[PDB]
Structures are given as C-alpha cells and as structure tokens.
Design a protein around this nucleic acid. Structure first.
Ligand code: NA
Ligand code: NA
Ligand code: NA
Length: 91
DNA sequence: AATAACCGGAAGTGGG
DNA sequence: TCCCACTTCCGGTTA
C-alpha cells in the first residue's frame, strides 16, 4: 500500500490535482495545500487506501504530523505548507 | 460568534 | 506477540 508522503509526492509530480496542492519551492521540497480545494485531495487519499470512512483533510493532516519526528514531512511555519526530506525527494 | 488553521493523546485497524 | 503505518475519535488552542 502506498505511503501518504509518496501519494503526495506523486501528485505533485503528475500535476493531476494542481488546484489542491502545489510546490512552493520544489528545490527545497516545500509544498502547500489549497484552503478551498484540499478536501477533494483528502477524499482521493482515502479512496486510494480503501479506508472504511471518508477521509478528511483533518485526518490526513493528523497522519502527516506523525512524520515530523522521523522526518519524511515536516510542517513549515506558513499556512498549509509542509516540506519533504531530501531522502524522500531523492528515492 | 463563525470560520479555519494548528495541535496531539489515545484507542482502533491493516498487514505483516 | 507486537510493530507498521496509519485511521479514527475527541478535544483543546490560536488567529
Ligand atoms: Na492505547
Ligand atoms: Na463528542
Ligand atoms: Na491566519
């Protein structure tokens, strides 16, 4: 099963949901969600996973917070903005 | 108030 | 047994 950080990186590479997520500085790996269109992206994550309940941005962000310690994705001090690690970006 | 971003402890689910 | 990688629940805080 695909991991959440990989799902997001794949979307950014494909450009399939450009109204919901975008790079801020791709060289640094920083990216940002749309305030008004993030829920559609969260719904897609839950359906891809086959989860029992509808996925929400809140639940997806709760999962994202767990990456802070291990480092794959860290929150940036800008609205709805996060940063992938160099390791995630290189693989 | 209404709206929304941000936080995380804890218990539940999946697939090893 | 017991960790993976989240998911779900419940709720609090800040702008
Ligand atoms: Na527990
Ligand atoms: Na409640
Ligand atoms: Na604000």
């Amino acid at each position: 099963k695909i991991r959440l950080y990989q799902f997001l990186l794949d979307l950014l590479r494909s450009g399939d949901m450009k109204d919901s997520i975008w790079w801020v500085d791709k060289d640094k790996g920083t990216f940002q969600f749309s305030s008004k269109h993030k829920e559609a992206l969260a719904h897609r994550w839950g359906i891809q996973k086959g989860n029992r309940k509808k996925m929400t941005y809140q639940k997806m962000a709760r999962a994202l917070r767990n990456y802070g310690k291990t480092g794959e994705v860290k929150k940036v001090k800008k609205k709805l903005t996060y940063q992938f690690s160099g390791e995630v970006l290189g693989r």
